[PDB]
């Protein structure tokens, strides 16, 4: 019924405070109101930017100019990656820390990179595993090094990518 995240722009900030004019003594004088409005409306701008200072620092929306700072703390350097996929690698490596490389587990990680039906996985008798891609939205060669990391120590892997079925 209520949002748990209380960090939001204050609703109707301006009309508040004006509500504290005692008994409409000054209201309708058009000389005191403008003086008060001019000062209060400055806080509006500062109040608004208080959110982006917290909202924009999250990894989901962080821009490349500062996303590097988030990656730097985790040891994931930009190298030659671009912004749209640099976000992906950060997620992939971080998610690897609570993984076991099971068949059900592997499907889950690939799920975040190719939608619901964009990926499928065949399995083979002698350590063979196969990955199929149908709806890639980013160039895969630069993402490939991580795709190896979350697999068992002895996996034998093939990678094939195509658009659609």
């Amino acid at each position: 019924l209520k949002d748990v995240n209380h960090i939001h722009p204050l609703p109707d900030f301006v009309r508040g405070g004006f509500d504290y004019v005692p008994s409409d003594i000054f209201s309708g004088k058009e000389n005191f109101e403008q003086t008060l409005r001019i000062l209060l409306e400055r806080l509006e701008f500062i109040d608004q930017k208080m959110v982006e200072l917290a909202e924009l620092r999250t990894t989901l929306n962080a821009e490349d100019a500062i996303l590097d700072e988030i990656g730097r703390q985790l040891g994931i350097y930009r190298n030659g990656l671009n912004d749209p996929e640099y976000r992906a690698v950060i997620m992939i490596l971080t998610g690897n820390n609570s993984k076991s490389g099971t068949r059900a587990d592997i499907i889950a990680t690939l799920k975040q990179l190719f939608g619901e039906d964009g990926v499928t996985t065949y399995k083979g008798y002698n350590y063979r595993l196969d990955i199929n891609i149908f709806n890639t939205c980013m160039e895969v060669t630069d993402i490939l090094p991580e795709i190896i990391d979350m697999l068992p120590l002895v996996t034998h892997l093939r990678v094939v990518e195509n658009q659609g079925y």
């Binding site: 960090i7 209060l40 595993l129 068992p152 996996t155």
Partner: protein, 484 residues
């Protein structure tokens, strides 16, 4: 003082800000400036001041958003997202139910999955066939003629048949007929089943999958079994899930109805608490799950060993073998496939547990298989150990043991049922110790062991070892005593 300090972020009250700004105004226009109550400057400054209180509070809230404590909502995910843990969404309750069916319902009839609802919010998990899902049976009173009995072996896959005649409808002949049926069933499945079937001679009825108080507790696993004259009342086990995801819970004996009543229906009830569904995951249990992730082990030999023993309604014993060098090795195994041996774990329920295996580890060897949907569907393999019963003879010198005093000794040899697959060695010295332990203290004692059915010449003292896929077994009635 109240801003950023060496010990975190603080909060200023309103009055301190009011006094500070009033002092600033005083300095602006000398000590004579009025700033209390009646001043227009007072009404402007006080109104102006309260707003920055909100700004300070919001700023203080922002700072803690990036700390182990204070994170909430969306910001909480980023903090724990660094450690690869994500909230769980809407979930659907899962569980199993049983229902008794009239004697007349044919075996081959199959219930349509999409034409029934257990109760206001439960439906069949999938299609269900009566055959192969019998869990308990009750036979009583009204049943002369010729009867056929069928059963699928739980280790092999060969159907077995038995032929009998019910020359009498009561008395010792009926008792003997029931005993013959009991012997027929116990020779297959698992020995634990025999503990849960008996005959109430006082009423001349046979109970399958009940307790001494006449409560249906079910057999050790779903099976198939038939009688050409379809007598008594049969019970089956179904799998049930909720219609829409959310929060819902049911107790051990809650489910009580089905909206579209199928012909021949008798009753329906629960056996154990359902895995209740949940709403959107909250912060508290999110932190709790993040805290207890240490024990979450998978895809390792100790992990797979532990998981099986704690996720199956049975699985008394388990053992694994490895062959990973270019060849089939002595034991018949493909070059790069694991081997898993279990006891009393069923087929489908245990198969689902095997999804903890390391990805790309082929495993998949054994005598029995099953298919599981991931989406794609894949097949897994395993085997069930073939029990081998022993015959034990005890000889001693001393006072004659009295009837009902041999019960302690007989049950004392229950340790013989605790041998492990392959690596099971009796160590007859251990048996001598046990037989001399489960009794009052106090001359001579010996133990002889042989396979069932062999002549008396087969008795020996050397220890016995289980085969590759065999496991030791023993029955109470297969113990004898001799005085010397």
């Amino acid at each position: 003082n109240y801003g950023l300090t060496g010990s975190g972020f603080n909060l200023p009250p309103m009055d301190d800000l009011v006094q500070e700004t009033k002092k600033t105004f005083k300095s602006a226009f000398g000590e004579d400036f009025n700033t209390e109550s009646n001043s227009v400057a007072d009404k402007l400054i006080q109104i102006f001041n309260e707003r920055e209180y909100q700004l300070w509070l919001l700023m203080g809230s922002v700072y803690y958003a990036q700390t182990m404590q204070g994170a909430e909502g969306i910001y909480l995910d980023d903090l724990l997202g660094k450690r690869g843990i994500y909230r769980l969404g809407k979930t659907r309750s899962t569980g199993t139910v049983v229902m008794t069916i009239d004697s007349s319902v044919p075996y081959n009839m199959i219930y349509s999955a999409a034409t029934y609802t257990i109760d206001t919010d439960y439906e069949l998990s999938s299609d269900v066939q009566v055959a192969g899902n019998i869990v308990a049976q009750l036979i009583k009173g009204t049943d002369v003629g010729t009867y056929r009995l069928q059963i699928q072996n739980t280790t092999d896959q060969s159907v077995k048949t038995l032929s009998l005649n019910l020359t009498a409808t009561s008395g010792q002949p009926l008792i003997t007929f029931f005993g013959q049926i009991k012997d027929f069933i116990v020779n297959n499945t698992i020995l634990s089943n025999q503990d849960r079937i008996w005959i109430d001679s006082t009423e001349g009825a046979l109970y399958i999958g009940y307790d001494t108080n006449k409560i249906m507790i079910g057999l050790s696993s779903r099976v198939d079994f038939r009688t050409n004259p379809m007598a008594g009342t049969r019970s089956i086990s179904m799998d049930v899930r909720s219609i829409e995801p959310g929060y819902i819970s049911r107790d051990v004996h809650s489910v009580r109805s089905i909206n579209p009543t199928p012909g021949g229906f008798v009753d329906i009830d629960n056996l154990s608490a359902f895995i209740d569904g949940s709403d959107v995951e909250s912060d508290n249990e999110y932190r709790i799950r993040a805290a207890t992730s240490i024990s979450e082990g998978k895809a390792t030999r100790p992990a797979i060993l532990a998981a099986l023993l704690n996720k199956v309604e049975g699985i008394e014993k388990v053992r694994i073998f490895n062959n990973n060098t270019d060849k089939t090795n002595s034991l018949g195994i493909p070059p790069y496939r694991f081997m898993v041996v279990c006891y009393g774990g069923g087929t489908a329920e245990i198969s689902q547990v095997l999804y903890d295996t390391i990805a790309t580890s082929n495993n998949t060897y054994g005598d029995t298989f099953y298919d599981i949907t991931t989406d794609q569907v894949e097949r897994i393999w395993h085997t069930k150990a073939a029990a081998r019963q022993l015959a034990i003879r005890v000889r001693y010198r001393g006072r004659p043991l009295s009837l009902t005093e041999e019960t302690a000794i007989a049950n004392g040899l229950a340790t013989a049922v605790n041998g492990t697959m392959i690596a099971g060695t009796l160590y007859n010295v251990r048996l001598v110790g046990t037989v001399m332990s489960s009794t009052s203290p106090d001359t001579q004692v010996y133990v002889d062991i042989k396979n069932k059915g062999q002549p008396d010449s087969a008795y020996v003292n050397t220890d016995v070892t289980a085969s590759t896929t065999q496991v030791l077994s023993l029955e109470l009635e297969d113990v004898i005593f001799s005085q010397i």
